[model samples]
Target chain A: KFRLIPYKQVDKVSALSEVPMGVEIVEAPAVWRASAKGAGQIIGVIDTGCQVDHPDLAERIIGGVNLTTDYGGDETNFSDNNGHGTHVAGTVAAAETGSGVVGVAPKADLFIIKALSGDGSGEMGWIAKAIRYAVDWRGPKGEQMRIITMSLGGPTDSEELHDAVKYAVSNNVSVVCAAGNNEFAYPAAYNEVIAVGAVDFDLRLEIDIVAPGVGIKSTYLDSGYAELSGTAMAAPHVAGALALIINLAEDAFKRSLSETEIYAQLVRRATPIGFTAQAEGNGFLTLDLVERITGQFT
Target chain B: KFRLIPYKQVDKVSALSEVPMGVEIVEAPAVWRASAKGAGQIIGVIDTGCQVDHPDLAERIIGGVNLTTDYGGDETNFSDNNGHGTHVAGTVAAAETGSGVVGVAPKADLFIIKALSGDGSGEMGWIAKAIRYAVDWRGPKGEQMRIITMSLGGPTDSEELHDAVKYAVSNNVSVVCAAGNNEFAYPAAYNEVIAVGAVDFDLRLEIDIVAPGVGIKSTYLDSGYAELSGTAMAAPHVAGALALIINLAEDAFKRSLSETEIYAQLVRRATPIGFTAQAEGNGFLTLDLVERITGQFT
Candidate 1:
């Protein structure tokens, strides 16, 4: 029987081990290294509110929304209670300014949506309302937005959420979410969402697509990195990847791609991880493959 | 009970009827009217490869990779045997030449990874190899690439495929795949992969974030608009959305975004759809919301 490793122990192993095969071990494609720098796109993270004041993530957190009435006060003032939303947000667009964790889209702006509270739980109504506000809300300069990432799910479903999603899509928004952690759950199982799974460092089908889950390290509220696990971690990996693809496509093609086009490109470019059909979805995440196909790198 | 609608009949939905509520359904967005295009991005379509010379899709087909050794020697000649890839390619990044279908990222470059055959069946090895090659291949002018779209998936999983995925992610490549039409299986189920489902004209989560899926009109082999559907059709919408996000982010933040960061930003900005928790992922695809966040209209 396999025993779960403690977060501290995993940290030690990460420090001592040879960077776990595919876990941040590969060299960033030359083209990516030269070209992939996030220009701070404003991303609205709708989850347990983040500690925007945290040093590492502070510079990136522009503002936010609080769905939880209990928080009472400015939505930007909301803090993460359950830690899940923070982790998800960090994974999606965290900054790399000496912070404990780095977001997939580091240079992008962030807006917190405090739908789920500290316990990693919230009502569907709160989520729906947050979506509506996100749709109508505008940035300081009034530019059209592009994408959204959500890492939470619940047993009960809501029609309001559906309407909100429809509203966003019709308006040309790209939305991504974590396929539920409960492998058997329906939300992740639903087709409408960009359901994400988890994976491990070995490029093996450890968890869904193997993100920094398990004893994965990331930024905490107190200007330090913490370890956490779940499909939540995996969700952000996909989100960050999307940013890179979008940026490269936009630059190279001199145009903006549709959400459907983005999806097709990703699926076509995915590397298949050798695992049971049920374990690994398409394969591990690799921006190198995308770079090569797009001619970003040789 | 809702029954399945025939593809032929379903494709005729008007733009007005298809527009979701809350969206200002004009003939097009302001950016398109102003001629703002996505440049420097490369979109790869890995399916029954497109006809490199198809009038509408011709200029957009930068180049392609042929995974099928069984096909004739001429890789560029590999047209869409199943017609799925051609339609998908047009939706994602077809050039804006006032032709049949206008792609989301009209100016984006397109590369074809011919992993699928005319029958729409491809092997895990071929798919994996195609992904690896795509990561390594260079584009016209030897510039680095940004995004790749895959409309293919296999029923059985493989280790090679997983490693390929890991390789892509570590390298910063963004891979988008189709959530299988067999809603009961796992292809898009993986974490690293962006698994896309379909939606309908009403902007409902017909499958997942629907695009012009059903007899969806798009560029076919001879510069003519053809109707198509499938999770494949939905994948490109996300790809196109990424293009717009990247451009807006770059303009707003005044810096280039990494693939990971861009992906995260897009997710963070996604709007939530209806109540079917799993039915709708983040929400609909919207440009207005993206503009508001990134603060870039054109």
Candidate 2:
């Protein structure tokens, strides 16, 4: 991925994979200092299957549901045969593997929903169902899904998908979607879900103020790694940023905030740009701004 | 959705949508000034379905085949219930309605393939079958299927899909696909196909050197128009670009050019940019350079 900072930095033990420029662009590390790297928050990934066992994502994956039977037909076995969801999940909550890359929310947990198939595509009904599943799902410890991230879209603008997005939002879950790499994309286009687009390394919204979507490096299939591009890559950045923001907000307030509250704070913090309303929904997403704008760092 | 040429130029008897910045950014209109508007060339759109009756696209949709039973089950019934394929089709060959927009190659004809379902997803098997049908089918005038544009993707990387892509390529049908709006996007990711990505009006590549994918206005269903963005929208620009290029080349050379021949010429004409191999492949696509780099137009 193209980044403003082209050089890699060294952590305490060894050299890091050089934080992806997307992370640096959003200054996620700076945000991490105040927040505990998205700890105590759950981000939901609804896309192709994710290889939850991949080292980078294994620990972060707390729960999942599979709507498609592309693999073994067991809804409980949400392992990703398709690498798309895995890469997206990694971008949201992957912890550092001394040798691998870290995520914007390294300490967060993920609730993966295999709505799409091993292939990159899935039914809108499946996605709608997955969204509802994420919204209704209760963690073992009674933690409800806090955020839902979707990187898939088609031009149909299905009512089913729209209803599901509204359902998630109405149920107090933050929804984020790909603004589309092509035509009028859905879920993302729906105002209820934050529509994310890729911006340049210089922090300009080529489309929307979403994070590093171009050739991003993250976890893939078979415990592997791949550098993927597009708004799909960008949505997770926002999703991760959401978790980080919520983690800090909840911790500081000593209680969970409402979904509308998080959405308002997140959009309020986006750096306004010159892009059209159709492209950048509000503005560029900045992780550090969450703490800067959200109630006091108190 | 946003453009370098953020202004509109008035056209005769009507106000046009300024030909979409993507069409101009790629200089398809400039290419049109010197050559035919993709006449005698045919592009196959394999996706959900194309609204064959959409005013902007009706005249250009010569024929289509449906592989799914979502609609009428018959190959003849390729109407788009989902707006995806129609928007994609319009991007390739949409005629300007008095109140709407036109596409890259307005004179080009299309063969719509309804491989996906109404809910914006499809079986990998259906897609595989659709590809074979598009490759094997002959036009009414017996025109050989020259190009196939697919905006759909799946994670499975099914052998069925791969072999069909290979089969189309072998048959000299140029297969162009969305480089993907997300991680591990397929058909486009396959080396056998031309994987297109989105770029900005500034002519910079976000992922791959392809076309204008973000927030582009194009034809949609119900004989309507919408601004859709994504690699799905970008793929057709290249697909249409190919048709425009091929139309002129075939007319100039009096013979069909091979897929490799078109690929080499297209890539050779791309404008290189400041990006990595994974992000911008060979740089930006400039349709105006087609004849300039191909042969002596003088």
Candidate 3:
């Protein structure tokens, strides 16, 4: 069985009136004001489910599917019961409502794929099916899924899961996964995915990059806000950063970049925070680091 | 029933490596390196019980009492089953363990006064009793309590609670309370207490200062770490700041400061953050703001 990447849910507040520190730590606002707020970009989140009606996240959701039998429903019942998906979705694209918390890519769209259940458990088959769904999913305006973020993993790699992840990358979708709290959890451990680790939180291996993972506040179970920590939280940051980068880079390059090129461009923006390469990977993710790059010319 | 000053426990982590952002936001480390870290000082925390054996907090806790009957009859059962007191205590005095989280005043001592139950509920009478207990309680070394921090409050004012606060001040103990999530909370509304509000979370009235209340990571249940937000979290920032100020100010002046004088010294150090006087009475609390002053002599 696969489980949601272990995260600590500690504190909560009735409302948050500003951009959360995690969003600010990644320099999302600076990019939001100067260039891209992730308009037209789409992120596929595979987790428990999502609160489709959260005031901060409602407008950004294109649609979703629930594959877990635990919820006793068909694929269309994608509403979140575990709250992990809601939090992850919010970090990726919750809107900038002036009164509550804003997310990393506030204008991006979300396509929720509920592979796990409220208990944070599911089979490998569910995950494989979800990845396939995310890669093949399309929106009303013909929007294609550009990124698939998974904050869940298992001890051993399954052929089905590995094949599904490969299919996504081969299809030009950037797949981001959380490097396990330990050293070896997949699809994060698989080279086919961009593995994310927590900033100041964990180890080396499969971690292509790090972002603010400690004390992250985002939209949660209710229409309220919460602060969670771990690589689970870190992956959404990269997913959202990918959305922002895609929008800004596409605008400047005036052409669609290949998945590999997009990955290269994202890595180009990493700023190391004094940790070993094994632990921090390329470095801490900061949007302002590549502010002056106007499409590394042909 | 009186409740925990309405906080949100949103996320948790197994451990934290550096100082929390809230601690850094108040400039606690700069003061720790340059001058004081609350050595020889004691702060009284009146809330739910505390995790006395917590790795980060164990060394700093002097002792405590449980006034709430929720944990059965006992003035000595001060262990934190609720987690609120442990979080508050950690924020004020969790030692620098180098691996887990650190607090505002690492060298300071904590006097736990558990007035609330494990569910974050208590009676006004219990709070009043706890305040009295905090003020009158002494240490094995005959160390006197210097400050009383309350992260709990009620809508209605009690004459007993008001008198207890007055008694604490008259005895030269600075009393700090959370400005209610709403406008008027008991002891906070009383002109006698130093009332704290969230930096970006709420309104005016009774709020003497604002601190980094939103997304505050500190000690939590199971000796783990959690990020919480509320004026409840903000109140302890001031409580810990008071300990540092007292240590530094008394050393420079070569004399003990009265409760009123210490309150003045603390308010004197506040740096406003673009809010009106009513909303942010003094301003944001930054330890570096008063670094240059040797002493404001008579």
| Per-candidate interface DockQ score | 0.02, 0.01, 0.01
Which candidate leads in DockQ? 1
Global lDDT of each candidate: 0.56, 0.69, 0.79
User: B18-79 in candidate 3: lDDT tens per residue?
Assistant: 88887887777878854468988899998888888999999998788888786674888899
- Name the better of 1 and 2 by DockQ: 1
**TM-score: the better of candidates 1 and 3:** 3
Q: Write the per-residue lDDT of candidate 1 for residues A112-179, one digit (tens) a residue.
A: 87876655556777777876777677877884456677776655445677777767655555666665
Which regions in candidate 1 have their CA more than 4 angstroms from the true location?
A: A1-298, B1-28, B31-35, B182-186, B206-212, B293-298
Q: How does the DockQ of candidate 1 come out? A: 0.02
Listed in order, each prediction's TM-score against the native is: 0.47, 0.46, 0.49
Model 2, A71-154: lDDT tens digits are 567988888776777778878878867756788899999988887776567766887888888888887779887899887767
Docking level of model 3: incorrect
**Candidate 1 displacement at residue B208 in angstroms:** 8.5
lDDT of 1 by residue, B59-152 (tens): 8766777777546746656666666677667677666565445777777678787777776666667778777877787865885455666766
* Candidate 3: C-alpha lDDT: 0.79
What tens digits encode model 3's per-residue C-alpha lDDT throughout A235-266? 99999999998887565545566565467557
Each candidate's clash count:
175, 18, 17
For B1-298, candidate 2 gives per-residue lDDT tens digits of 0001111222222223557777777878877854588887888888878887777788898889888878568878898887778878877888755646788888888999888778777777887887898888888678756889877766566787899988987678888877655334666767668777776665554233467777677776666666765556778888888888776645543444566445544553455554443565545677654333221111
